[PDB]
Amino acid sequence: SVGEDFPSEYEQWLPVPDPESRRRAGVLLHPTSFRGPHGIGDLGEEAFRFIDWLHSTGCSVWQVLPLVPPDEGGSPYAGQDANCGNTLLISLDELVKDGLLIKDELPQPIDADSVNYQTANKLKSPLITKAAKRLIDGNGELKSKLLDFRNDPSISCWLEDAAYFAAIDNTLNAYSWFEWPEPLKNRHLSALEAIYESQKEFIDLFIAKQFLFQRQWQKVREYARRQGVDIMGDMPIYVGYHSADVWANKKHFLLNKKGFPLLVSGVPPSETGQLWGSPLYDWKAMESDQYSWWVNRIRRAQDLYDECRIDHFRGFAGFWAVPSEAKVAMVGRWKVGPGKSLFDAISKGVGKIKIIAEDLGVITKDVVELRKSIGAPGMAVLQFAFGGGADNPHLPHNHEVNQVVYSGTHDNDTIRGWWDTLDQEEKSKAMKYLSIAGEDDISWSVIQAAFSSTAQTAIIPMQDILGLGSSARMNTPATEVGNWGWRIPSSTSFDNLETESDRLRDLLSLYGRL
Amino acid sequence: SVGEDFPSEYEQWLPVPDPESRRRAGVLLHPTSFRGPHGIGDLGEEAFRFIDWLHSTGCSVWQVLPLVPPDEGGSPYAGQDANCGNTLLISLDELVKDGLLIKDELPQPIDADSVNYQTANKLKSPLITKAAKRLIDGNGELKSKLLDFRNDPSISCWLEDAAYFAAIDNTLNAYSWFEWPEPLKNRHLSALEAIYESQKEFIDLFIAKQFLFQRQWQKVREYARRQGVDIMGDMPIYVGYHSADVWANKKHFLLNKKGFPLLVSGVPPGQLWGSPLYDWKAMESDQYSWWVNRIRRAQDLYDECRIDHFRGFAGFWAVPSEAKVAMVGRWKVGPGKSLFDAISKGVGKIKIIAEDLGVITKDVVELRKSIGAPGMAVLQFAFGGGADNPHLPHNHEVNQVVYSGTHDNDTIRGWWDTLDQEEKSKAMKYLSIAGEDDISWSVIQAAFSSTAQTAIIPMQDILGLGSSARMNTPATEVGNWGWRIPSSTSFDNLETESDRLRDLLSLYGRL
Ligand SMILES: *[C@@H]1O[C@H](CO)[C@@H](O[C@H]2O[C@H](CO)[C@@H](O)[C@H](O)[C@H]2O)[C@H](O)[C@H]1O
Ligand SMILES: *[C@@H]1O[C@H](CO)[C@@H](O[C@H]2O[C@H](CO)[C@@H](O)[C@H](O)[C@H]2O)[C@H](O)[C@H]1O
């Protein structure tokens, strides 16, 4: 009460920092980029080595791209399935440790400066298949865990649909499921039973391969956790038309009576538009079963990652809808998204989640309110900070605490590449704001700025830590060829980055991110 | 409804920046520091020139120290009164424009590289007195405004008390009001009436001089507003014992039956400030009216106001008045948010800055955040300890005022010069530093680059001055509060400094 003495412990009653507010940093590196002899990175020794190296820097976050099966061009964003793992990430050496292969079966190593997906498939698939076959034919512990995995309801609600879809796709020569014969197209029960009988082996193998992915990924994830590293994933808001996700859940999407999309995704114009062409969600239909499809999707995301970015988060508040009949995106309209009620349903369904909102480009007031109402951080990207004036939200003095700052993403050139093509004027702006030593180390200047931010989380692509140029760019949007291929040079091992590790640690130390 | 079309105006529905969140910057400069011929800066031409210069830089905040009558050492923090203005800031030239003096009456100029208060008083007081006398003897517009000022209830609730207190203090030879004879000490009504009769002239002149201060300060304030400059003031949480504030409001303080403080202020290690303390429960019973009036006066003087030792609203150190050292005290519970609720109901929206430096407790932070008041960061304190130091830029908050230093710190150049090596190498890593000559611009730049919404720089640092321009050194009794802009440096002569500031404000979005 007012005017009275405090207890003797008043002087010691200091403010304690909230542990959920802890400043941190991390590295963006997709596992396909790891070194190794089999044409593609994988979840074996290089993953653990990278985790050790990451830990040694003081970083506590590892961000990956979606771990789904990619398209033939390698893209993790136009995947074949929203919940399955990319089986080409499976490590053959780890299969040997599991007793599912022997050393003499391993293929001769190949040089692959960049990932060629066709080549990695030819090399690895037969062996993964053979391992899966031995797993299914065995009795004993590993087989017993396959069964737990298979009969786990949170797995089976997506895994059986995915396996049947893949069995049918394998059996049929057809562009997409729109062209399937009606009983398969529309999942007649006795058609599905007939598929299980006739493609039983394929289905059991597919399931086995997903188990093996899951097992290897969970080991990487538990090892990260033991080293104090959280794993941050990514998911596109939309899924592709030719997938189990759509085919097994037609009523949750905006399709006509024949299963063809009424409306597809995109954004309006600086252009004639941009037509992505994904089917759109039927959000009122989803509302009627408490958003169960999205709840399951997040449950799988939780299973894979500690935290997850959602690409095109703005779509939850309002989305651009183009007539499927159209060739340009400029003919669409904006539709009302589900807003917070979706996230309420997810919370009741799954508990606490950690979502990052990709909120780049021009966005509307409702996007910002939705993001803030669920407490999700947005993004800042230093590479975008030097156009326009001092109100540019990517400039450090405009950063927020509840935010993730990047030097650049997988969609941007490396900092060195970006610097090299930077327009004079943007460059002189940058020179004033950044602390730049030699232009060779331009990537460290940007890294330092990212770390000096008030944003709680700073993420740096591995390409920038390695100071690489444009040829190490992961993706160039709106190109159909030559993306997703980057690998750590075969020369650079995690034993050979002590200087880089020290330099990062010193910066994290200085800006309070350790 | 979910899935339905938005109106056609969706694409244009962009986020608007909130105007209350606008990033800005300003300069700390007390008006006594202005150049001029009369021994001290004043509210005349130099104030308006400075405002013009400030506007030309892009700054939109001018912070002053308390404008109260100071003690004999010049200190605005151990003032004679919490609500009166320092009459020595009154401009003689502005009195000539008001027709209360003529040019021929103005004194010969004197050299005063620093403010000598005794010298400014000898020079200016007779003229201010004479002006006040002509004002009271006149019958026109100006006289009519004096009367409105005098009879305005929001003025008279402090001004009459202050005038009588000063009249008695002038009439009596006594250390403090504790030694006054009982009827004066305890404000017997017929004693006060006797004072009005016998000191009528002194009282009317005192009131007239406060009117003239008010008039000149309000003109400076309006001129600032017209040039897009808000004025930020300061007030110590506590007032001095020998003041009208205590004497006319005894029940609101922790005094014994004889009017001697039971407990006085300070902080532990000790430091004994020795001010009387508030009787917060007694204040509670008239809805904190004393504090409400105080804030009303602060609103009248400033757009925004810092409160020195804000932590005292949540918990305060209380020393027995008996004592010579502060280490034997105890912590007592402050009024918290209920005070600020009362202020809001009384006065409406306020803009308060919490001085929250040093070691502070969890309740201090919660109170500050619950009323939405910004705290402080001071770059000069940022390089001791580790990376969790709250004064480092990466730990700043938006709702915060960042300083390079305050009036209690050395200039950046002076500070740099005495900085110990481990702290100095730390600074070199965080700051962008060129030559030691421009060390103050390195710190200014860091301040401006902060996420803090408001950045304030002492004029000494803009001028790149050393330790001799330090305004105050705490716990010293002599040589403080004297700094003046060198007579050579005019606001016409700071184009380079203006440009350099504008460029930095432009870059960090504070224009
Ligand atoms: C955000 O999502 C988009 C998907 O629309 C990704 O875009 C990449 O992938 C698509 C599909 O493979 C491709 O057509 C684009 O050219 C490519 O940029 C982004 O990478 C994600 O960050
Ligand atoms: C905060 O308030 C204190 C008052 O306790 C000021 O301290 C200065 O003034 C006092 C009173 O004249 C003097 O004793 C100190 O030595 C001096 O530091 C600060 O200046 C204010 O910021």
Numbering used by the authors:
A (entry chain A): 60 to 328, 332 to 576
B (entry chain B): 60 to 328, 335 to 576
Per the authors:
A further structure (BCD) was determined to 2.3 Å resolution after soaking an AtDPE1 crystal in β-cyclodextrin. In both active centers, there was only sufficient electron density to confidently build a maltose unit occupying subsites −2 and −1, this being covalently linked to Asp-373, and overlapping closely with the sugars in the equivalent subsites in the donor pocket of ACR-A. Weaker electron density was observed beyond and contiguous with that for the −2 sugar, indicative of a −3 sugar residue. In contrast to the situation in the ACR-A, the acceptor site is vacant, the gate is disordered, and the brace adopts a conformation comparable with that seen in MA3 and LF. The covalently bound donor most likely resulted from a slow hydrolysis of β-cyclodextrin because the soaking solution should have been devoid of linear glucans. The first of these may be to adopt a catalytically incompetent configuration for the acid/base catalyst (i.e. Glu-420) in the absence of a suitable acceptor, as we observe in all but the ACR-B structure, and thereby preventing it from activating a water molecule and leading to hydrolysis. A second protective mechanism could result from the perpendicular arrangement of the plane of the nucleophilic carboxylate group to the plane of the −1 sugar, such that the anomeric carbon is partially occluded and less accessible to an approaching nucleophile, as noted in T. thermophilus AMY, which we observe in ACR-A, BCD-A, and CAM-B (Figs. 7 (B, E, and F) and 10D). The donor site could be represented by BCD-A, and the acceptor site could be represented by MA3-A, specifically from the latter, the sugar residues spanning subsites +1 to +3 with the partially closed gate trapping the +3 sugar between Phe-331 and Phe-446.
